[PDB]
Amino acid sequence: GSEFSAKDERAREILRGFKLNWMNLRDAETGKILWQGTEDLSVPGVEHEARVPKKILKCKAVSRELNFSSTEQMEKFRLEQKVYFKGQCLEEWFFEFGFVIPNSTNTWQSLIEAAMPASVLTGNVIIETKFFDDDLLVSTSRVRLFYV
Ligand SMILES: COC(=O)[C@@H](N)CSC/C=C(\C)CC/C=C(\C)CC/C=C(\C)CCC=C(C)C
Known part of the structure; x- marks a missing residue:
């Protein structure tokens, strides 16, 4: 049992004011689109799915482009991602x-x-x-x- 802090409140404000508009993946050797989404894959507490073409597993590199909106100001917006297999x-x-x-x-x-x-x-x-x-x-x- 604790206070709902100033940091708790601001994290909640950033989340409610943030949206991922769209995302895509390009083969980095061709610059061609492999996969596009408009689903907000950022939303917490929902078990999201993505169906990417299996040929992506062949690519040496992919580029990923995100477009997002934020009502709140952020000093250093950043992502950490971990990839899990079972x-x-x-x-x-x-x-x-x-x-x-x-x-x-x-x-x-x-x-x-x-x-x-x-x-x-x-x-x-x-x-x-x-x-x-x-x-x-x-x-x-x-x-x-x-x-x-
Ligand atoms: C085994 O699969 C592989 O990753 C290999 N093909 C090597 S690399 C290719 C890239 C892929 C398939 C990973 C793309 C990532 C996805 C679909 C997750 C997108 C999620 C976000 C960008 C996070 C959204 C959340 C925000 C902005 C808070």
Whole structure:
């Protein structure tokens, strides 16, 4: 039993004012779109799914582009992602956007390098994402991946 702090309140404000507008993945060797979403995969407390083309597992590198809106100002917007296959953490990724202007829309591109078959991976891979503003944890969200 504790206070609902100033940090608890601001983390809640950032979450209620944040939306992921769209996202896509491009083959980094061709610049061509492999997968697009408009579903907000950022939303915590819902068990999200993504159905990506199995040919993605072939790519040496993919670029990921996010477009997001934030009513609240953020000093250092950043993501930590862990990739799980049946509970084993296979990858740990860090991406930094930086300062977010209040009531702004923003585009963010990152590069992911391909560090087992689609038959086995499909439905057994979870990406867990932690959304921070510096050291304030705003949300934790999870996406189960399928290769189709
Ligand atoms: C085994 O699968 C692989 O990852 C290999 N193909 C190597 S790499 C390719 C990239 C992929 C498939 C991972 C893309 C990531 C996804 C679908 C998760 C997107 C989630 C977010 C960007 C988090 C959204 C949350 C916010 C903004 C708070």
